[model samples]
Target: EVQLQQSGTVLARPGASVKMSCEASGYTFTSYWMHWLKKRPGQGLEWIGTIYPGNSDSSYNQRFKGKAKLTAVTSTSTAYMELSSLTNEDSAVYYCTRERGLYYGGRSFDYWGQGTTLTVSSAKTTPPSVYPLAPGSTNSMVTLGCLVKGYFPEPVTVTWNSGSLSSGVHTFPAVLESDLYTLSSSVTVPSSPRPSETVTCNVAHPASSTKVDKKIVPRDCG
Candidate 1:
C-alpha cells in the first residue's frame, strides 16, 4: 500500500525558486529517509540528496549543495524539495525515492514518485499514444500488459479496469526518448478468464486531461 503522490508541473522563471512536494502514505513516514533525484532532458539520473523526517537531519551531493534543499513534515507525511537559482539547465523531472529496506546506501529504491516536472522556460504537451498489449502466460498466472509511449512530461499514472489497483500491479518509471516519455504496466491475474471478461489499461496524465483506456479480452479465454 506504499504510495508517493507527487505534485504537478511547475513553471518557473529564471533565477526563481520552486518547491515541489511528494506526499507519502500507507506507511510510516519518519521511519525512512527520503531521497531526491534529477533527470535532465536526454540525460541520465542524478542523485541530489536525502532528508530524514524524524529529526530534520539532511545530506546532499556536493553538486547540489547550494542548488537543492530537501525537507519534510512528519505531521503531513510529505517530503518537499526546493530548487533555487533556476535556469534552463535545472529544467527536468525530479523524483522522490526511498529504498524498501531502510538501508544505509540509497543505491537502489523500490518505490518512486510519479515524478514532478519543473519547467524553466519550457512547455508543450503530448499525450501518450496508448496500446493494450496482449496477455503473456506464466506457470500459474497471466500477465496483462500495457504500453504507453510518445508522451510529453514524465510521470503518467497507469491503472487497470479503473482497477484502483494497489497490489499485483507492475509499473515502470516513464522513460525519456526523443523528448517524449514512455511507460509500461501490467497486472497478474489467475489464468483462464471468462470469455465475457475484459480488462482495461487506463492511462492518466496532466496533458491528456482524461484517462485513455484500452480494453482487451484475454485471448486464451476468448
Candidate 2:
C-alpha cells in the first residue's frame, strides 16, 4: 500500500506561519506526483498544488495560489507545504496524497496521510492582489503587461479586444509568480491608430472574473 506519513500537530498562533511535511513510502516516490490539500472545520476541500518530485515541476490551484506552497525531497521521499501569515481560517487538517497512478493510471486522489492538525488561535483572510493594465509597444506591435500578484485562487485566461489598432489580438504565454500568476497579450493594427483608441483586457476563472478597458496607444514601431 502506498503511504504518506506527515508531521504532527501544530499549535500556531494567529499572525505566524507553519511548515508541514509528508514522507512517502512503499513505492518510488520520485516516479509519482504528490499533491497538497486542505480541510477546514466545515468548508469545501482546497487543492493546494502538485509537485512532481521527478523534476521539481509544480503548479497550484488559483485559490490556494498565495496561501499554500508545495515542495518535496526525493532523497528522503518526502513532500512539504509551508503556509505563511497564519490566520484562524488557515488552521485546518492539511493532507498530502499521491495521484491516481503513473500517467495512464486515473484522475482521482488516492493514498492519504493522517493530515496534520494545525490549530491556529487567531484570524485572517486571504484575497488576491489587483493587477493594473499597462500598455507597451514593440516591433510594430503592442504588449500589455498586467501584474496580478500576491493573491489566491488562480486566475486563468486573459482575453484581448481588438477594438483599435486592430489587425489581430495576440495573447502571450502565462507566467507565474509565487502567489499571483502573471498574464499578457497584445493587439496589432495595420493602420494608423486613433488618439481615441481603446481596448479591453479580461481575466477569467470559473469562480469569478474581472476586466479592464483603457485609452491605450500603440507606440515606437518603425
Instruction: Output the TM-score of candidate 2.
Output: 0.52
Q: List model 1 lDDT by residue over 1-222, tens digit each.
A: 789999998878788999999999888999887999999878999999998889999999999999998999999999999889989889889999875565776456878999998877543577888887875445566677789988876568888888755568999987667767798997877666623477788889875685788886655643
TM-scores for all predictions: 0.54, 0.52
Regions more than 4 Å wrong, model 1: 102-107, 122-222
C-alpha displacement of 90 in model 1, angstroms? 0.6
The digit string of per-residue lDDT tens for model 2 on 1-222 reads 887899987767677878999999999998878888889867887888999997989998987778777888889998989888788678678888888653585567778998888867532222434354554443454345344444334445555553433346665554435534455555554334432465555555433444444334445568
Among all windows of ten consecutive residues in candidate 2, which has the lowest summed lDDT? 122-131
Against the correct fold, how does model 1 do in TM-score?
0.54
| Residue 214 displacement (Å), model 2 | 72
lDDT of 2 at 201: 55
Ten consecutive residues with minimal summed lDDT in candidate 1? 135-144
The lDDT of each candidate is: 0.83, 0.67
Highest-TM-score candidate:
1
Top lDDT prediction, candidate number: 1
Query: Deviation in angstroms for 219 in model 1?
Result: 47
